[PDB]
C-alpha cells in the first residue's frame, strides 16, 4: 500500500545516507569530547580515540560519496563533500595533537590545540548533520 520499494522518491533513498554518517558525524563528535576529557588524566587513552577518529572519518566522507549522489537538492548535495572536506583537515589536526600529547602529557600546549580543535570539529560533524536534514525529515 504505497511504500518506498514500488513508488520511491528520489530523496527517499537519501534518507539512508542522511542516517548513516551522521551516526559516524556523532560517532565522531562524542570521540573528539572523549578526548579533551581523557586529557586530563589519559594521555594514552587517546591512542585508540586518535586511531577511532581517524578510523570513522574515513567512513563519514565516504558515505559523502553516495549520499551527494541521493540528495536531490544541489546545496544538500554539495554540503556535504564540503564538511568532510573540512573534517579531513580538522580531524588530522586533532589526531596529531592527540598524538603529540599522547607522547607529553606535561605540555599544556599540546593539550590546549586538542581541546581547541574537538568543539570546532564537533560543529563540523554537526554541519553534516544539519547539511543532510536541510530536507528536514
Avoid: W
Avoid at 90 to 103: I, W
Amino acid at each position: 500500500g504505497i511504500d518506498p520499494f514500488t513508488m520511491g522518491d528520489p530523496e527517499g533513498s537519501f534518507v539512508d545516507y542522511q542516517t548513516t554518517m551522521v551516526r559516524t558525524a556523532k560517532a565522531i563528535a562524542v570521540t573528539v569530547q572523549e578526548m579533551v576529557t581523557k586529557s586530563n588524566t589519559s594521555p594514552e587513552e587517546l591512542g585508540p580515540l586518535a586511531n577511532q577518529l581517524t578510523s570513522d572519518y574515513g567512513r563519514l566522507a565516504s558515505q559523502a560519496k553516495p549520499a551527494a549522489v541521493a540528495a536531490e537538492n544541489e546545496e544538500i548535495g554539495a554540503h556535504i563533500k564540503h564538511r568532510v572536506q573540512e573534517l579531513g583537515h580538522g580531524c588530522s589536526a586533532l589526531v596529531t595533537k592527540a598524538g603529540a600529547l599522547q607522547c607529553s602529557p606535561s605540555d599544556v600546549y599540546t593539550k590546549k590545540e586538542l581541546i581547541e580543535c574537538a568543539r570546532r570539529v564537533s560543529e563540523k560533524v554537526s554541519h553534516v548533520l544539519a547539511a543532510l536534514q536541510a530536507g528536514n525529515r
